[PDB]
Amino acid sequence: ASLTEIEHLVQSVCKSYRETCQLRLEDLLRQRSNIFSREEVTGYQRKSMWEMWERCAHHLTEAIQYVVEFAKRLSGFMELCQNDQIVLLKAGAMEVVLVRMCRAYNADNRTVFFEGKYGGMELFRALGCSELISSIFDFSHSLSALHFSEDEIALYTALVLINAHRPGLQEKRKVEQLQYNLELAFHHHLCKTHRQSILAKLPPKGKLRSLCSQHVERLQIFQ
Ligand SMILES: COc1nc2ccc([C@](O)(c3ccc(Cl)cc3)c3cncn3C)cc2c(Cl)c1Cc1ccc(-n2cccn2)cc1
């Protein structure tokens, strides 16, 4: 891959993300700044466990269909076979939604945007899984410390999808060829404007998988 192809690949990844960002950063920080009142937070707490999972699953499902639209717009993804297309999405689509919900978590007050205002993990007590909500708050609190830009998570969410390990993979080599073209493209745009020590950390590994636990599996039952 030549020099100018990497620059055209980097441009296409952020081009796909800016169209599939779903909420656009600007309004997320614009409503920092609008926090649920004490009467409003109890209204969400007062909802039944079924009522709140039915809302959260609708949020989760609608956020994944943007991730697929993100995946369908990458330069190179559609060139893989559709067997590899599903199996990369099945494994990764939920993993990037957490990485995308990094946007609209506010590390100043430890709150998260949800349906118009900013809440905090006591907003989601109706799910009955405070251990899972607390630990995704910990995940987003770690991402916010790196001060991720818009084009930076565009590349990063693409590398979470394009993983050439996984289970299945008919054209395993064709995945590695696209993965290599994106991870060098990630380090190229990174070397420009000198942000080289957000790479030395970048978790270690495995915690991104650990929070896709047995609470958010199947989950068809909800309307
Ligand atoms: C941290 O708790 C949450 N934070 C959220 C923050 C934002 C949004 C979001 O949908 C949104 C989604 C994507 C982008 Cl880019 C922007 C906004 C949204 C808010 N307002 C409008 N929208 C569209 C939903 C959240 C949800 Cl559902 C939860 C609960 C929850 C979290 C995780 C799991 N889970 C499942 C598997 C593992 N864990 C279950 C339930």
Contact indicator for 41, 122 with CB cutoff of 8 Å: yes
| Cα 4 to middle of ligand 1, angstroms | 37
| Cα 60 to middle of ligand 1, angstroms | 6
Any ligand 1 atom below 6 A from CB of 101: yes
Contact indicator for 111, 32 with CB cutoff of 8 Å: no
> How far is it, in rounded angstroms, from Cα 197 to Cα 147?
12
What range defines the domain where residue 51 resides?
Answer: 1-223
* Residue 86 CA, distance from chain mean position: 17
Of the candidates 132, 153, 141, the residue with the CA atom closest to the CA atom of residue 111: 141
Any ligand 1 atom below 6 A from CB of 126: no
Amino acid letter for position 66: Y
Of the candidates 50, 41, 59, 144, the residue with the CA atom closest to the CA atom of residue 97: 59
- Method for this entry: X-ray
CATH (domain of 43): 1.10.565.10
Cis peptide bond prior to 33, omega within 30° of 0: yes
**DSSP conformation letters of the chain:** --HHHHHHHHHHHHHHHHHH-SS-HHHHHHTTT-B--HHHHHHHHTS-HHHHHHHHHHHHHHHHHHHHHHHHHSTTGGGS-HHHHHHHHHHHHHHHHHHHTTTTEETTTTEEEETTEE--TTGGGGGS-HHHHHHHHHHHHHHHTT---HHHHHHHHHHHH--S-SS--TTHHHHHHHHHHHHHHHHHHHHTTT-TTSTTTS--SSHHHHTS-TTSSS--S--
> How far is it, in rounded angstroms, from Cα 147 to Cα 120?
20
Q: Is the dihedral of CA 33, 37, 38, 44 positive or negative?
A: negative
> How far is it, in rounded angstroms, from Cα 90 to Cα 167?
10
Q: Which residues contact 208 (CB under 8 A, 6 or more apart)?
A: 95, 98, 99, 139, 160
Any ligand 1 atom below 6 A from CB of 23: yes
Task: Give me the resolution in angstroms, 1 decimal.
Answer: 3.2
> How far is it, in rounded angstroms, from Cα 124 to Cα 46?
10
| Cα 72 to middle of ligand 1, angstroms | 22
Contact indicator for 49, 128 with CB cutoff of 8 Å: yes
Any ligand 1 atom below 6 A from CB of 100: yes
Which residue do the tokens 């296409």 mark?
Answer: 12
Mutational pocket test of ligand 1: of 25, 28, 64, 101, the residue with most ligand atoms within 8 Å of the beta carbon: 101
Of the candidates 191, 165, 164, the residue with the CA atom closest to the CA atom of residue 180: 164
Q: How many domains does the chain have?
A: 1
> How far is it, in rounded angstroms, from Cα 186 to Cα 15?
14
Contact indicator for 137, 114 with CB cutoff of 8 Å: no
Of the candidates 80, 66, 70, the residue with the CA atom closest to the CA atom of residue 159: 70
> How far is it, in rounded angstroms, from Cα 148 to Cα 23?
16
Both tokens assigned to 23: 């909420």
Both tokens assigned to 108: 């100043």
Any ligand 1 atom below 6 A from CB of 129: no
Mutational pocket test of ligand 1: of 24, 30, 60, 150, the residue with most ligand atoms within 8 Å of the beta carbon: 60
Q: Which residues contact 16 (CB under 8 A, 6 or more apart)?
A: 70, 73, 74, 154
| Cα 10 to middle of ligand 1, angstroms | 27
> How far is it, in rounded angstroms, from Cα 60 to Cα 54?
10
> How far is it, in rounded angstroms, from Cα 68 to Cα 89?
7
